[PDB]
Amino acid sequence: MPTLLRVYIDGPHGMGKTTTTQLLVALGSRDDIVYVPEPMTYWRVLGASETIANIYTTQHRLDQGEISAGDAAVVMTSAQITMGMPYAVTDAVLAPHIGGEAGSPPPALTLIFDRHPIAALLCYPAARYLMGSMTPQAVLAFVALIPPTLPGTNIVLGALPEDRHIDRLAKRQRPGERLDLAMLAAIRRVYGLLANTVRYLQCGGSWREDWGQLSGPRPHIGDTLFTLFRAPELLAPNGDLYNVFAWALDVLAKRLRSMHVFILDYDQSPAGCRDALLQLTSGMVQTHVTTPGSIPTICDLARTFAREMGEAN
Amino acid sequence: MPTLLRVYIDGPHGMGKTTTTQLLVALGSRDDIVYVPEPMTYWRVLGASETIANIYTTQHRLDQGEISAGDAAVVMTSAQITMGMPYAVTDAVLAPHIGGEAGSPPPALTLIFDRHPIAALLCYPAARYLMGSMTPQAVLAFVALIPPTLPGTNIVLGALPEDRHIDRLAKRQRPGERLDLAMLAAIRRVYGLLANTVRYLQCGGSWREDWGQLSGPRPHIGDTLFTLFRAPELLAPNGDLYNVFAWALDVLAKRLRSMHVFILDYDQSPAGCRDALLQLTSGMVQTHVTTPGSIPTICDLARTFAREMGEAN
Ligand SMILES: Nc1ncnc2c1ncn2[C@@H]1O[C@H](COP(=O)(O)OP(=O)(O)O)[C@@H](O)[C@H]1O
Ligand SMILES: Nc1ncnc2c1ncn2[C@@H]1O[C@H](COP(=O)(O)OP(=O)(O)O)[C@@H](O)[C@H]1O
Ligand SMILES: Cc1cn([C@H]2C[C@H](O)[C@@H](CO)O2)c(=O)[nH]c1=O
Ligand SMILES: Cc1cn([C@H]2C[C@H](O)[C@@H](CO)O2)c(=O)[nH]c1=O
Numbered sequence: 001m002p003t004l005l006r007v008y009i010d011g012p013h014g015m016g017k018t019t020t021t022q023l024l025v026a027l028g029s030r031d032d033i034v035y036v037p038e039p040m041t042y043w044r045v046l047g048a049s050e051t052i053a054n055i056y057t058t059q060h061r062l063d064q065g066e067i068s069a070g071d072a073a074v075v076m077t078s079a080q081i082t083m084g085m086p087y088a089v090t091d092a093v094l095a096p097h098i099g100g101e102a103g104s105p106p107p108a109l110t111l112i113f114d115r116h117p118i119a120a121l122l123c124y125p126a127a128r129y130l131m132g133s134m135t136p137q138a139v140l141a142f143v144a145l146i147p148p149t150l151p152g153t154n155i156v157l158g159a160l161p162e163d164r165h166i167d168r169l170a171k172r173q174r175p176g177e178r179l180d181l182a183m184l185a186a187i188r189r190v191y192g193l194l195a196n197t198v199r200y201l202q203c204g205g206s207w208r209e210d211w212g213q214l215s216g217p218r219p220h221i222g223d224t225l226f227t228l229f230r231a232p233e234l235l236a237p238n239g240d241l242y243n244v245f246a247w248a249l250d251v252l253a254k255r256l257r258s259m260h261v262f263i264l265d266y267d268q269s270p271a272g273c274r275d276a277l278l279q280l281t282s283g284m285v286q287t288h289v290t291t292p293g294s295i296p297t298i299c300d301l302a303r304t305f306a307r308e309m310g311e312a313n
Numbered sequence: 314m315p316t317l318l319r320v321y322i323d324g325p326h327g328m329g330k331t332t333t334t335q336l337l338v339a340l341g342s343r344d345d346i347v348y349v350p351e352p353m354t355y356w357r358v359l360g361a362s363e364t365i366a367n368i369y370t371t372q373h374r375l376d377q378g379e380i381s382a383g384d385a386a387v388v389m390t391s392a393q394i395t396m397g398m399p400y401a402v403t404d405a406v407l408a409p410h411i412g413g414e415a416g417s418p419p420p421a422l423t424l425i426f427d428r429h430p431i432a433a434l435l436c437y438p439a440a441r442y443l444m445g446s447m448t449p450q451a452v453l454a455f456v457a458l459i460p461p462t463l464p465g466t467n468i469v470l471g472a473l474p475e476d477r478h479i480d481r482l483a484k485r486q487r488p489g490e491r492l493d494l495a496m497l498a499a500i501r502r503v504y505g506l507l508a509n510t511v512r513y514l515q516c517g518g519s520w521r522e523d524w525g526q527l528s529g530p531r532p533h534i535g536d537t538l539f540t541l542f543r544a545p546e547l548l549a550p551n552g553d554l555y556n557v558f559a560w561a562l563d564v565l566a567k568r569l570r571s572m573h574v575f576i577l578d579y580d581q582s583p584a585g586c587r588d589a590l591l592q593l594t595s596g597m598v599q600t601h602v603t604t605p606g607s608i609p610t611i612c613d614l615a616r617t618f619a620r621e622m623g624e625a626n
Contacts, residue, residue, distance in 0.1 A: 039557075042557060046450070046555060046557065047450045047454075048448070048450065073391070074387055074388055074391045075387055077390070077391040077394060078386070078387045078390040078391055078451070081390060081394070081451070081454045081455075082450070082451075082454065084454075085450070085453070085454040085457055085557070086557055088454070088457040088458055089453075089457040089557055089560045089561050089564060090560070092457055092560070092564045093560050093563060093564065095461075096567075135361070137359070137360045137361065137395070137398070138391070138394070138395075140398070140402075141360075141394045141395065141397075141398040141401070142394075144398055144401040144402040144405055145401055145458045145460075147458075148408075148461070242359060242621060243617050243618070243621050244352075244355060244359065244398070244399055244402055244618075244621070244622065247402045247403070247405070247406050248402050250406060251402060251405045251406065254409075304556050305556070305557075308555060308556050308557070309557065
């Protein structure tokens with residue numbers, strides 16, 4: 001039985017995610033390692049035009065008081081649906097080939113993904129929500145749509161001090177981006193809350209029993225994503241969340257619970273970061289594929305994605 | 314082992330769906346039959362304000378040339394996310410309790426749902442796409458997000474001549490609706506294409522082998538939803554769909570394939586329609602629940618939904 005290893009490099013933008021994985025795959029590691037790049041072409045052309053631009057422009061006009069939060073929210077929402085679509089469809093076709101977890105044993109194939117579905121379906125929307133360009137109900141709608149967590153979902157979140165992050169953020173500006181530190185802070189905070197949420201849950205956390213603590217390495221509820229959703233728009237007159245919104249948080253918990261997060265330190269040289277990623281790989285969960293044909297089908301799948309939707313990896 | 318029966322009454326609006334199910338549950342059928350109503354309160358208040366109004370107004374202004382197709386599309390998209398959210402979250406929490414199909418045997422509990430997730434995630438968006446207020450890429454994004462089809466998903470689509478439909482459409486106008494026959498035709502056509510798509514697939518249909526037939530009771534490809542997606546925005550220079558868009562159609566097929574559709578004729582009296590629905594029930598697939606506690610948890614779930622998000626069933 002062959003094994004597949006799936007790694008999702010994620011975290012806030014402009015940290016060294018692209019720089020470090022492209023070096024990772026640049027070790028001449030046969031054909032057993034494949035890199036699935038950010039689908040910039042989908043975002044800029046295929047799905048709609050200059051979406052990244054659309055987003056950064058829209059937050060700007062909002063900040064300059066040129067549009068209402070309502071108008072911002074509508075645009076931001078449709079924008080995000082577009083951002084994550086490539087994520088969703090890939091995961092959707094990759095589902096029927098992922099079998100149970102085979103412990104931590106030569107992975108016949110290794111997929112290094114650039115971002116996991118939660119990035120566009122949960123992480124960014126939540127930041128926009130913090131930036132005032134997204135409604136909490138809009139966020140929970142994406143949450144309710146997050147696909148079931150597949151076995152062996154290894155997510156590598158990054159770590160890098162604010163100052164060094166800003167510098168690197170400056171050097172690399174995606175086509176249509178605008179330097180927005182407020183967003184840099186929101187995105188950073190959301191990702192921190194996420195990692196904590198996983199831990200909190202994996203240590204027996206139950207958002208329902210701890211909800212009262214809000215209503216006033218062993219992270220408490222207050223240090224998790226759940227705090228964001230204690231907004232007035234979501235609270236019934238009796239002070240409890242409405243059942244729809246509670247169930248969404250339930251689904252949030254079910255999805256996050258079974259994810260394996262690792263924290264790659266980026267505060268170092270491209271070589272080092274590459275080595276560290278590689279070092280982490282040793283301890284990541286592998287899984288068996290459902291059919292003998294899965295590996296080639298999967299190998300080719302990634303290749304097709306990368307070819308058709310990557311700008312330059 | 315207890316069994317659950319799940320029925321999804323769907324089809325275009327203003328056909329008698331509410332009128333006929335409320336009579337169905339009105340036979341004094343103990344506590345074994347539960348009706349999950351349209352979540353109007355979520356649409357009108359909880360999720361955002363007067364969404365149904367937002368939609369009908371937005372299509373109107375578009376038609377009057379007061380907004381661009383682009384502006385229409387953005388609004389329409391976020392609107393729809395909001396429309397289906399209650400659908401998505403319910404299905405999401407109902408997932409872990411649905412086990413395999415137990416043939417067609419007294420269903421311990423029977424849930425009569427008002428619309429299935431595909432209504433807001435596929436059916437309506439596709440109509441708006443036809444109305445020019447939604448982009449095909451927007452539609453396929455919702456498609457890629459349709460949750461895995463659960464066992465025993467029984468979907469009852471309705472049948473009623475255009476003339477009789479229009480009349481009934483007039484008598485019942487949801488808060489904020491606008492009589493739009495163009496939409497009535499688009500919605501009707503989409504739902505027809507859907508039923509055909511199921512059949513087509515269940516008779517060994519493969520959209521990939523039949524794609525060429527487009528590129529020019531045994532329904533051919535041309536009579537299915539697949540025809541809608543042969544749009545220029547989705548076609549590569551070489552005449553084939555781009556791989557992202559193809560995979561989405563793949564996911565469309567995987568989702569539709571395992572659904573059980575039935576066609577309830579509405580061209581009759583409320584009593585008759587009720588009897589016919591009841592008659593169909595006999596031949597619908599049941600499934601076992603995953604835990605002994607599932608039934609009560611599920612029974613209560615439906616009750617909570619109905620209570621908190623139904624206007625008057
Ligand atoms: N280890 C590193 N040390 C210093 N600068 C780096 C390092 N890795 C990447 N960079 C630079 O910082 C910017 C952001 O990195 P990049 O990998 O391109 O972003 P992202 O995290 O968004 O994928 C780029 O200009 C890149 O050259
Ligand atoms: N069997 C029927 N014959 C004639 N009119 C009907 C019948 N069932 C419902 N109606 C009427 O047609 C309108 C639409 O029906 P309704 O069930 O309310 O809509 P929907 O299909 O959208 O749920 C209502 O005014 C209703 O009174
Ligand atoms: C994944 C994702 C990225 N982005 C932005 C962050 C970066 O500028 C760029 C991804 O590199 O797009 C979003 O705005 N939303 C998203 O969902
Ligand atoms: C389910 C759904 C209904 N509708 C409209 C049709 C009806 O006017 C009303 C549902 O009864 O809302 C949409 O516009 N989009 C949807 O996704």
